[PDB]
Structure 1
Amino acid sequence: TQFGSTLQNIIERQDAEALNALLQNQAAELILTNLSIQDKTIEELDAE
């Protein structure tokens, strides 16, 4: 039962790690989109 508890903790921790990696990858994608948006903003000002 101690191995049982240890394993459960590893599993929950393993999943937590996977989530943090997922969230950071997702953040990177939104930033790239935001960079494209900002470029258009700059072009808009040049158009003005």
Structure 2
Amino acid sequence: VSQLTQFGSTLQNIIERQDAEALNALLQNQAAELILTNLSIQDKTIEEL
């Protein structure tokens, strides 16, 4: 049983880590998508000048 509890603690640590890394990859793909509109805004500011 104590061996099982040790596998259960390793399993909880794995679950927490993998979920945080899926959030880390989500925020990067989301900022990669957010950058394009800023580029378009800067380009149209040039046409304004």
- So what's the TM-score if we normalise by structure 2? 0.86
Q: What's the CA shift string for 1:1-48, capped at 9, x where partnerless? A: 111010000000000000000000111111111001111111111xxx
* Percent of residue pairs identical: 100
Give ranges in structure 2 of 5+ residues lacking alignment. none
Q: Show structure 1 runs of 5+ residues with no match.
A: none
Three-state SS of the structure 1 residue aligned to 2:32 is: helix
Task: Give aligned pairs, total.
Answer: 45
Q: What is the TM-score of this pair, normalised by structure 1? A: 0.87
- Cα distance in 1 between the residues matched to 2:38 and 2:21: 26
Structure 1: which 4+ aligned runs deviate by more than 3 Å? none
